[PDB]
């Protein structure tokens, strides 16, 4: 059933250069997201190239496309590990001035009551970025959410 999508994802995975490869990953996505795990992996690679080389708003758009397979299609664990690894790559590469907005969009899309560590660790690291930003107003709202999540992590 998924025999085609696996091959097109594996074919677009090579190429080395992002030229014509991003459009091939877009073709993998265009083969409709019925599963759609392979579209998630295609976008994950598209993200992996986009913030590493040139343009950033396109990465924000494709990341917003990634934030749809959280509850449906792909499991919570694989999406959590993918988001965590991507956030670590951006944190090592670029600084707060881009990273903070991606953290904000991640928390804006994770509107789910079952998110325990998924909401917490992202809100905590955003709190650290807000501490580096010298913002204390919205940081109190972040700390209000974090304190109300309990009323290990409390410390």
UniProtKB/Swiss-Prot annotation:
Phosphorylated by CK2 and PKD kinases. It is found in: Cytoplasm; Nucleus. Component of the CSN complex, composed of COPS1/GPS1, COPS2, COPS3, COPS4, COPS5, COPS6, COPS7 (COPS7A or COPS7B), COPS8 and COPS9 isoform 1. In the complex, it probably interacts directly with COPS1, COPS4, COPS5, COPS6 and COPS7 (COPS7A or COPS7B). Specifically interacts with the ligand binding domain of the thyroid receptor (TR). Does not require the presence of thyroid hormone for its interaction. Interacts with CUL1 and CUL2. Interacts with IRF8/ICSBP1 and with nuclear receptors NR2F1 and NR0B1. Interacts with NIF3L1. Belongs to the CSN2 family. Essential component of the COP9 signalosome complex (CSN), a complex involved in various cellular and developmental processes. The CSN complex is an essential regulator of the ubiquitin (Ubl) conjugation pathway by mediating the deneddylation of the cullin subunits of SCF-type E3 ligase complexes, leading to decrease the Ubl ligase activity of SCF-type complexes such as SCF, CSA or DDB2. The complex is also involved in phosphorylation of p53/TP53, c-jun/JUN, IkappaBalpha/NFKBIA, ITPK1 and IRF8/ICSBP, possibly via its association with CK2 and PKD kinases. This is COP9 signalosome complex subunit 2. It comes from Homo sapiens (Human).
């Amino acid at each position: 059933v998924d025999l085609e999508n696996q091959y097109y994802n594996s074919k677009a995975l090579k190429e080395d250069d992002p030229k014509a490869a991003l459009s091939s990953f877009q073709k993998v996505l265009e083969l409709e997201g019925e599963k759609g795990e392979w579209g998630f992996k295609a976008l994950k690679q598209m993200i992996k190239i986009n913030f590493k080389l040139t343009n950033f708003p396109e990465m924000m758009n494709r990341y917003k496309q990634l934030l749809t397979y959280i509850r449906s299609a792909v499991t919570r664990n694989y999406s959590e590990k993918s988001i965590n690894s991507i956030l670590d790559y951006i944190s090592t590469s670029k600084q707060m001035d881009l990273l903070q907005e991606f953290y904000e969009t991640t928390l804006e899309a994770l509107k789910d009551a079952k998110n325990d560590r998924l909401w917490f660790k992202t809100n905590t690291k955003l709190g650290k970025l807000y501490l580096e930003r010298e913002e204390y107003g919205k940081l109190q709202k972040i700390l209000r959410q974090l304190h109300q999540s309990c009323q290990t992590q409390l410390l």
